[PDB]
Amino acid sequence: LKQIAKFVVGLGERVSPTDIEEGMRVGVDRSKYNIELPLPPRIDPSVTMMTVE
């Protein structure tokens, strides 16, 4: 987690092991952490995202 606390999570039902990549940003459920949806990696574009013409 972004606040810093690691959890070992299971496998969602809208996802397969093939869609989950490593380093990939993922939504976890805030009710019980579990990967739900893979979400475009990198939170870093914001000064490389506003220089696309």
Binding site: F7, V8, G10, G23, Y33, N34
Partner: protein
């Protein structure tokens, strides 16, 4: 059958600060590795094969471990799972390293 009710995900991550390795049985005058004059030391003597784990909430708990996870596994600085609800070492997780490092392979 009860082992399979506990094993459910998700669960907290920890590393092992120090394995104490007190002696669970060595006398009934104690119940620790330490031996000292006088019987009845009440529940001060009740520390055996024991894990002080430090969680990824950045706190430290003592507990008397689960012997599922042996203390022949545990060394200082191993990744361990710990059940979140009551801090018990649920399992050992294979040691892994930063996601950026993993990409280099």
């Amino acid at each position: 059958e009860k082992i399979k009710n506990n094993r459910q995900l998700p669960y907290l991550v920890a590393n092992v600060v120090e394995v104490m390795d007190m002696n669970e049985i060595e006398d009934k005058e104690n119940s620790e590795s330490t031996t000292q004059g006088g019987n009845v030391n009440l529940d001060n003597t009740a520390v055996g094969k024991a894990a002080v784990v430090k969680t990824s909430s950045r706190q430290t708990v003592f507990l008397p471990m689960v012997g599922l996870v042996d203390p022949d596994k545990l060394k200082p600085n191993d990744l361990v799972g710990v059940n979140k609800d009551s801090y018990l070492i649920l399992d050992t997780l294979p040691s892994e390293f930063d996601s950026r490092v993993k990409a280099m392979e």
